[PDB]
Structure 1
Amino acid sequence: PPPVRLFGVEGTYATALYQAAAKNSSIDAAFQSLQKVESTVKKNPKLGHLLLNPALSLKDRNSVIDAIVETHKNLDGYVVNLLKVLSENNRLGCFEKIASDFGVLNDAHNGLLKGTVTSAEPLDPKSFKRIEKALSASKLVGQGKSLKLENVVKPEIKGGLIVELGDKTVDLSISTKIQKLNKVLED
């Protein structure tokens, strides 16, 4: 069974992929391998950027698929058959898509709770350790789920920072406050 339903279209595939791989307890293997066979398509700079979008028949693409699994033999049997399904329906542009979703599904299994802690400027490393500590202490991460902090630089966040993870957010920015203020000026 799937644990929860995430993603809209091209998530029906990702859903289906996790639940097939669930019965063996090897999704982590499947997904890692998928990253490594997807990357070797990318490091095929012609016909792996020039055949993501439909351009050639179902059958030629299918044969592009056959050639991808003969050169990489570790991909797991669920992901060698998922490629067949995608090639027969004749799609490869939303190939990275199933891959991305399948990662989110997998990391719900690992029990990782991925998170972006955007700031105006890159913060210090000490500021980082302390946010990771605190966020664990706060009841937004009850514990049982292992937070990761990913630093991003966004000069579109003009002052302050925003901590984001799951459906729980604390927006403690300057940028919003300025926007609100600018509107409020009457006298």
Structure 2
Amino acid sequence: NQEVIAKRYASALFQIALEQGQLDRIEEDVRAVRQALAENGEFLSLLSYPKLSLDQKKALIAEAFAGVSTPVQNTLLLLLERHRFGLVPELAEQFLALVDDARGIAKAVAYSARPLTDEELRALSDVFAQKVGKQTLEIENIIDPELIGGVRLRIGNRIYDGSVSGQLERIRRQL
């Protein structure tokens, strides 16, 4: 039930970033906040501690989350006032999904038995950009050497498989 509320808050911050014309800085420091809270997970447990008052936690955010832009810091303080500081990485992921939807960047994960060359990655991006309707596209590559001689590419929740399951398909068809 947290991802819909993160989508809510991230859509509000996205509309603010578009009306201020500063989408790139909000994307950059939201990536910074996500990396900083994924680096250390004790910060949320510190801000859930009852003996710290709300003004002390606001001072911790104003001193620690400095250098980020003003709507990002106001969003973090608004989450702190609403006891919704647990969904800041979910807010960051939903907001970067909205930013990549705005820029047209798609996220894809390709599983290949060999490490793919950059020309092949550009070719796959040029193929699937017309397929998903987006302008450009990104590929993340993991080897996973249980795969034998092919690519298994996943855009969102759709898997484009051509690596191993041809043999699994034919042995399911013979039996």
TM-score normalised by the chain length of structure 2: 0.75
5 Å-filtered alignment, 1:1-187, equals: 8-41=4-37, 45=40, 47-48=42-43, 50-51=45-46, 55-57=48-50, 60=53, 63-119=56-112, 121-125=113-117, 128-137=118-127, 139-140=130-131, 145-155=135-145, 157=147, 160-165=150-155, 170-174=160-164, 176-186=165-175
Task: Give the number of aligned pairs.
Answer: 172
Q: Which is further off, 16-25 or 177-186?
A: 177-186
CA gap of 1:50–1:182, structure 2 versus 1, over 3 A, is farther
CA distance in 1, matches of 2:18, 2:56: 28
Q: How big is the shift at 1:59?
A: 6.5
Q: Identity of aligned pairs, percent?
A: 22
TM-score normalised by the chain length of structure 1: 0.71
The higher-RCO structure (CA 8 Å, 6+ apart) is 2
Q: How big is the shift at 1:178?
A: 4.1
Structure 1: where are the runs of 5+ without partners?
Answer: 1-6
Deviations 1:117-172 (A, max 9, x none): 122x34242xx412422541563166x71222211233465653222336765321
Q: How big is the shift at 1:179?
A: 3.9
Aligned alpha-carbon RMSD (Å): 3.2
Query: Which structure: greater helix fraction?
Result: 2
CA gap of 1:10–1:72, structure 2 versus 1, over 3 A, is closer
Q: Do 1:41 and 1:48's aligned partners in 2 also have CA atoms closer than 8 Å?
A: yes
CA distance in 1, matches of 2:50, 2:43: 15
CA distance in 1, matches of 2:125, 2:41: 45
